């Protein structure tokens, strides 16, 4: 067979798959996927038949339920969603290499032609509020303005949800909290805030990042009554206590927080919309929002009919075209993020009115994996771990911020650094068990081994470590100032991760004020519009800590569903 509906119509009819008229169900192929699992079994069933001992395409991290046409496309060739990170050793029937083209908004001009007829039809929805994106703070949005009474309608374009959010890990950032109380931390919304400023050079709008703080409590718990687990709480850089919360053990943050946002809309009925994508904020005669035109990856495009339209479409990270123009100098770096976090959303706002700000500020993040081409999380140092050179010693402060990180590592032969750490640090932090299970966390009984595994040299890290854990020891790092020292270096066998920077968060977007509404460039605000999450401009200034993003798409999120249900 030449596809996937070719061969099982030898044996079968069409409705087998289709529904009686044969027209598809919706853009999430709903009634469609109901058929494959009909036959073939939930993903988890499937999953029981494609086991490899370290990775499983039918099992993975990613939250929610993963439909089968995700990968699976029945009249034409498809690929693998995880070959846009990944490269496994993989055999689906029908495949094709990953390779994602998807149309710019300008370029989309070209369809006038279908895009005049659907604006000239009756919408196809009469909502109260939309949200474009489905991750953090997109389904915050959703939930907040339905529990508030509004009716939503959430759009997503990729086919499964959660963005970016859904990879995150070293934790959401909150202060003054019960966890940490609990774990016998003691911190302050205004001690959050100070970190932040500085954090960011002092660049970004005060406003915003008071919102930030002294939201962040009421984040947690909000969460937390929603079903999440937030009770383990950690160390990040340029922070002045631990506050960066995750799941119990140091689990990732960001698939756990996806599932528990994702489980809370179905059990609120809300209309969630995959392979949609949000195209053009509509405006009436007075210049306020109206509607959305969204193209359907399978129905084509139409129209809701709206009060409010909520912007949560996330960075453009990805687009290295976009961040080289504005940073030269991270031209041909590899991201950290999802195939689709382009910018589109942005470009979405601008057409719409909105002015951007703060754009030049592009976070590169210290650690990727050399081996692995994935982000490691910034709590495997904030838990005790070290970064050694091919020289094998110190170099940089493990917990200064992202920008200085990336610089000193740069800076280093190869300009690659290994993160060094024990068993001890290994069983603080379970995420680090994921680093292990793909294969980038090479182990030995000894820094002479594992140096000569590594190319390091082996007596000179085996010496470094001994000084560090002396430092540890006497609580005082005097080579290069680390703040806070929370383990020695000695427990069971060691291991090196090699990493390298790569692109990951973009600080700049949509101007928006504290009631999140997007304005212009006389900051002037433009009638229903809100902008929440990493699309937005102003919360970080020029540099983001560590644990600040997930902060923000709750708190911003949450805040943007509820005004606009409110103003209607
Ligand atoms: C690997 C990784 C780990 C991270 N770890 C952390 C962490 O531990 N702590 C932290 O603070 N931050 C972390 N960050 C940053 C944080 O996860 C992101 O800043 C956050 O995902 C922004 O969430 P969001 O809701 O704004 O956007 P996203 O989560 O990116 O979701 C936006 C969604 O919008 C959809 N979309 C875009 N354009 C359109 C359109 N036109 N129509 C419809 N849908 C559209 C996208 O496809 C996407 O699904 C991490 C980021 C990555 C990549
Ligand atoms: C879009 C929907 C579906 C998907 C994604 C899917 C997936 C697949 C795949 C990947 C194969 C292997 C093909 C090959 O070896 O070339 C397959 C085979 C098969 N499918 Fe489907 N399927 C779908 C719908 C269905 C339905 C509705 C039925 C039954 C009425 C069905 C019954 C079977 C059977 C019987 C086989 C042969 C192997 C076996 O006996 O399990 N499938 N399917
Ligand atoms: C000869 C039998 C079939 C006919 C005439 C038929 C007809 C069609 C048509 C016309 C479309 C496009 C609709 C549109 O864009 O509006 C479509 C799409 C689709 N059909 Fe079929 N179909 C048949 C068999 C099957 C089978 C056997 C399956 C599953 C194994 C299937 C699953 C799907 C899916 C998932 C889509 C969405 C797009 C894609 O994945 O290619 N169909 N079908
Ligand atoms: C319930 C949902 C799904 C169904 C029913 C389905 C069906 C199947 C079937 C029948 C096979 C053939 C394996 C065999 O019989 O040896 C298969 C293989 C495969 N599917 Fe799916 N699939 C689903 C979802 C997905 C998703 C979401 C993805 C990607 C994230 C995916 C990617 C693949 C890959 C890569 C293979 C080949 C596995 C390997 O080489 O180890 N499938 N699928
Ligand atoms: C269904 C699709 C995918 C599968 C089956 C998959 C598989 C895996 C596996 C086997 C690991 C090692 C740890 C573990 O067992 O969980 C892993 C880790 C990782 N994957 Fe994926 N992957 C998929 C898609 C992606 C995509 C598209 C991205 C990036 C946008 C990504 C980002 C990562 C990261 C950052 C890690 C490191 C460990 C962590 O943060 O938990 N994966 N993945
Ligand atoms: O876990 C990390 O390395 C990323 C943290 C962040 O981007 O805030
Ligand atoms: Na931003």
Redesign the pocket.
């Given at each position: 067979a030449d596809n996937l509906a070719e061969f099982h119509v030898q044996n079968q009819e069409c409705d087998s798959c289709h529904t009686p008229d044969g027209e598809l169900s919706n853009d999430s192929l709903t009634y469609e996927?109901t058929q494959?699992?009909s036959?073939?079994?939930?993903?988890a069933?499937?999953a029981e038949?494609?086991k490899?001992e370290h990775?499983?395409?039918?099992a993975?991290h990613?939250p929610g339920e993963?439909?089968?046409?995700?990968?699976?496309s029945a009249h034409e060739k498809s690929m693998?969603?995880?070959d846009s990170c990944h490269s496994?050793?993989?055999?689906?029937?029908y495949?094709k290499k990953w390779l994602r083209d998807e149309p710019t908004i300008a370029e989309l001009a070209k369809d006038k032609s279908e895009r005049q007829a659907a604006l000239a039809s009756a919408p196809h929805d009469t909502v109260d509020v939309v949200v474009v994106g489905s991750g953090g703070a997109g389904f915050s949005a959703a939930i907040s303005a339905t529990d508030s009474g509004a009716k939503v309608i959430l759009i997503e374009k990729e086919p499964?949800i959660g963005g970016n959010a859904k990879l995150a890990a070293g934790g959401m950032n909150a202060a003054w909290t019960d966890q940490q109380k609990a774990k016998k931390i003691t911190d302050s919304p205004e001690l959050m805030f100070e970190d932040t400023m500085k954090g960011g050079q002092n660049i970004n709008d005060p406003a915003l990042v008071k919102v930030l703080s002294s939201h962040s409590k009421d984040s947690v718990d909000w969460m937390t009554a929603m079903g999440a687990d937030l009770t383990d709480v950690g160390m990040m850089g340029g922070a002045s206590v631990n506050r960066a919360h995750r799941p119990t053990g140091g689990a990732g943050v960001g698939a756990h927080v996806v599932q528990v946002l994702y489980d809370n809309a179905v059990k609120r009925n809300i209309d969630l919309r995959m392979n949609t994508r949000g195209i053009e904020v509509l405006k009436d005669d007075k210049g306020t929002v109206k509607g959305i035109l969204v193209k359907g990856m399978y129905k084509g495009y139409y129209w809701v009919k709206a009060d409010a339209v909520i912007l949560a479409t996330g960075g453009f990270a990805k687009n290295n075209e976009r961040v080289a123009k504005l940073d030269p100098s991270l031209k041909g770096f590899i991201s950290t993020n999802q195939p689709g976090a382009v910018g589109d959303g942005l470009d979405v706002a601008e057409n719409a009115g909105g002015a951007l700000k703060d754009m030049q500020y592009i976070f590169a993040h210290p650690t990727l994996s050399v081996k692995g081409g994935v982000m490691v999380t910034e709590a495997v140092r904030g838990n005790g771990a070290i970064l050694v050179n091919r020289e094998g010693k110190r170099f940089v402060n493990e917990i200064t911020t992202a920008d200085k990180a990336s610089a000193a590592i740069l800076a280093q032969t190869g300009k690659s650094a290994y993160l060094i750490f024990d068993d001890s640090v290994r069983k603080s932090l379970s995420k680090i068990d994921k680093y292990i299970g793909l294969g980038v966390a090479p182990t030995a009984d000894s820094l002479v081994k594992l140096g000569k595994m590594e190319g390091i040299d082996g007596k000179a890290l085996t010496e470094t470590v001994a000084r560090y854990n002396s430092l540890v020891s006497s609580g005082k790092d005097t080579d290069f100032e680390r703040p806070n020292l929370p383990r020695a270096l000695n427990e069971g066998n060691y291991y090196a991760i090699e990493v390298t920077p790569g692109v990951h968060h973009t600080m700049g977007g949509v101007m928006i004020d504290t009631k999140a509404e997007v304005m212009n460039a006389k900051k002037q605000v433009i009638p229903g519009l809100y902008g929440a999450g990493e699309v937005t401009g102003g919360v970080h200034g020029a540099n983001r800590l560590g644990g600040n993003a997930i902060s923000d798409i709750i708190t911003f999120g949450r805040l943007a569903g509820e005004e606009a249900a409110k103003y209607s």
């Amino acid at each position: 067979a030449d596809n996937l509906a070719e061969f099982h119509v030898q044996n079968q009819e069409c409705d087998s798959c289709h529904t009686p008229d044969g027209e598809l169900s919706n853009d999430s192929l709903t009634y469609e996927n109901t058929q494959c699992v009909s036959c073939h079994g939930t993903l988890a069933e499937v999953a029981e038949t494609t086991k490899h001992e370290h990775y499983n395409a039918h099992a993975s991290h990613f939250p929610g339920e993963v439909a089968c046409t995700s990968c699976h496309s029945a009249h034409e060739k498809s690929m693998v969603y995880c070959d846009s990170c990944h490269s496994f050793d993989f055999n689906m029937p029908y495949a094709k290499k990953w390779l994602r083209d998807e149309p710019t908004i300008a370029e989309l001009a070209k369809d006038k032609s279908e895009r005049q007829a659907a604006l000239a039809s009756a919408p196809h929805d009469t909502v109260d509020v939309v949200v474009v994106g489905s991750g953090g703070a997109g389904f915050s949005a959703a939930i907040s303005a339905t529990d508030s009474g509004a009716k939503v309608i959430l759009i997503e374009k990729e086919p499964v949800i959660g963005g970016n959010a859904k990879l995150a890990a070293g934790g959401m950032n909150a202060a003054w909290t019960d966890q940490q109380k609990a774990k016998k931390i003691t911190d302050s919304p205004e001690l959050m805030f100070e970190d932040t400023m500085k954090g960011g050079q002092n660049i970004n709008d005060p406003a915003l990042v008071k919102v930030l703080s002294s939201h962040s409590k009421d984040s947690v718990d909000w969460m937390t009554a929603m079903g999440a687990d937030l009770t383990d709480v950690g160390m990040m850089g340029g922070a002045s206590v631990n506050r960066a919360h995750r799941p119990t053990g140091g689990a990732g943050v960001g698939a756990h927080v996806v599932q528990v946002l994702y489980d809370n809309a179905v059990k609120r009925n809300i209309d969630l919309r995959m392979n949609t994508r949000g195209i053009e904020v509509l405006k009436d005669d007075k210049g306020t929002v109206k509607g959305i035109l969204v193209k359907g990856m399978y129905k084509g495009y139409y129209w809701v009919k709206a009060d409010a339209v909520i912007l949560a479409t996330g960075g453009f990270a990805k687009n290295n075209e976009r961040v080289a123009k504005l940073d030269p100098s991270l031209k041909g770096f590899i991201s950290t993020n999802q195939p689709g976090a382009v910018g589109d959303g942005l470009d979405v706002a601008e057409n719409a009115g909105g002015a951007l700000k703060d754009m030049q500020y592009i976070f590169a993040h210290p650690t990727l994996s050399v081996k692995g081409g994935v982000m490691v999380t910034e709590a495997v140092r904030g838990n005790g771990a070290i970064l050694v050179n091919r020289e094998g010693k110190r170099f940089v402060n493990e917990i200064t911020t992202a920008d200085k990180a990336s610089a000193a590592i740069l800076a280093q032969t190869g300009k690659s650094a290994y993160l060094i750490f024990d068993d001890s640090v290994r069983k603080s932090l379970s995420k680090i068990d994921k680093y292990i299970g793909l294969g980038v966390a090479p182990t030995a009984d000894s820094l002479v081994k594992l140096g000569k595994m590594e190319g390091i040299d082996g007596k000179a890290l085996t010496e470094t470590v001994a000084r560090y854990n002396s430092l540890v020891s006497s609580g005082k790092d005097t080579d290069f100032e680390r703040p806070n020292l929370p383990r020695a270096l000695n427990e069971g066998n060691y291991y090196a991760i090699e990493v390298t920077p790569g692109v990951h968060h973009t600080m700049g977007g949509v101007m928006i004020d504290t009631k999140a509404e997007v304005m212009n460039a006389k900051k002037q605000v433009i009638p229903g519009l809100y902008g929440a999450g990493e699309v937005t401009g102003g919360v970080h200034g020029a540099n983001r800590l560590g644990g600040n993003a997930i902060s923000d798409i709750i708190t911003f999120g949450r805040l943007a569903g509820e005004e606009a249900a409110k103003y209607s």
